[PDB]
Amino acid sequence: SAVSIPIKNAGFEEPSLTVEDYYTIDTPPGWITYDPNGLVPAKRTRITSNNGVGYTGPNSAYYNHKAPEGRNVAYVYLAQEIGSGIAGLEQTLDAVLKPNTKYTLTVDIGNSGGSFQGFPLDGFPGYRVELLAGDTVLAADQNNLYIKEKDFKTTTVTFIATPESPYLGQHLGIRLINPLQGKFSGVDFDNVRLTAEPAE
Amino acid sequence: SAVSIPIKNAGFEEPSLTVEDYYTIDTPPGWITYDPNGLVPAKRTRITSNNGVGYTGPNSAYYNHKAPEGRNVAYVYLAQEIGSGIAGLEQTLDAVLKPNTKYTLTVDIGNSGGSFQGFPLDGFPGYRVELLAGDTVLAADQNNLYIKEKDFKTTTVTFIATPESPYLGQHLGIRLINPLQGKFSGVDFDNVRLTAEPAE
Ligand SMILES: CN1CCC/C1=C1\C=Nc2ccccc21
Ligand SMILES: CN1CCC/C1=C1\C=Nc2ccccc21
Ligand SMILES: CN1CCC/C1=C1\C=Nc2ccccc21
Ligand SMILES: CN1CCC/C1=C1\C=Nc2ccccc21
Ligand SMILES: [Ca+2]
Ligand SMILES: [Ca+2]
């Protein structure tokens, strides 16, 4: 029997947004911008690399169906050329890595489609989802799921920490990454969940 | 109906070894060493970081079962401390990245156990498996599978290339990586396969 690990703003439902297709351009509350190649400015515009939340409802321009969870999805957009690097959202959790524990990290990934002000949203930069302890990537999935235009799909990253793990006691983390491997170079995320259960 | 893509020395059966638990310390034929943090020297000894093939039959001291395929597995051993970097095995293939095609990379991963002349082999450095186009990681699995001591498990890495992919016409590649996330810091591979099939 699997226990949920608390995540802040796990569904990006904060801040609440009023109108369909509206969005913020500030880091979703409870999350941090992961920007190892310095592609995302502190003060963003609508044409810079940016991240935030977007109201995706039953009549979204960008997806067939509403947000997998609630009304909002998170998004990560990189303006720069392909190969310029990677960026995304990260959150350090209160839970620490425990031995003999199977961790299950699920998140829905969106390939926004259609168009914004005449600009085609066709194409996708890919995704990479990472479970961390300290500053170590313990386990990751990059692009194992194909995601159609205007669609979302759930991925699962799993990891088992042994008593021998050098990372026990270190704070867990979750990273949601735009690897900038295609244009249009926007990727969306929703419904982040992490569970712990006993393993052998 | 998936077509298999030709890989040199896919099963690490070259070179042909004849005695149980014997092993080479040179890069398997067909493959190059992947050594981006300079942990693996050009002239190796039995005590340096190294890679090679290893006869793994029904009597092996390191695995319960024989090699997943044939009588050899590949190994990648890193002598340096955890965190010192990553290394592994790489092979650029003939075949290139085609649009509307689903690639399935499967490879068996081995957690050597037991002991060698008293020295214990418990612990595991993790693994990462990469499908490449050119120098780009299209898709990857890092440590989604838990591998018990003395066991092998099969991982599957899948990727779909869309007609608007930037890497079409670049050579497919395979990387099998020891990310030095634990000790004993050896990891084994066997039975690499890559298939292609039409994809929506
Ligand atoms: C292309 N751009 C740059 C910033 C403005 C914009 C979008 C606005 N909403 C959007 C929803 C989906 C995709 C793009 C946008
Ligand atoms: C604001 N931006 C900039 C580019 C990407 C984007 C959105 C992505 N998904 C969304 C869903 C609803 C509203 C906006 C976006
Ligand atoms: C324990 N060490 C490091 C130095 C040499 C070595 C091994 C030799 N054969 C081996 C087979 C399996 C695992 C390790 C070794
Ligand atoms: C020779 N080495 C160096 C350290 C690791 C190792 C082996 C790993 N698996 C193996 C299977 C058969 C024989 C040797 C090894
Ligand atoms: Ca949501
Ligand atoms: Ca798209």
Ligand SMILES: [Ca+2]
């Ligand atoms: Ca073999």
Ligand SMILES: [Ca+2]
């Ligand atoms: Ca081991």
Ligand SMILES: [Mg+2]
């Ligand atoms: Mg920045």
Ligand SMILES: [Mg+2]
């Ligand atoms: Mg070297």
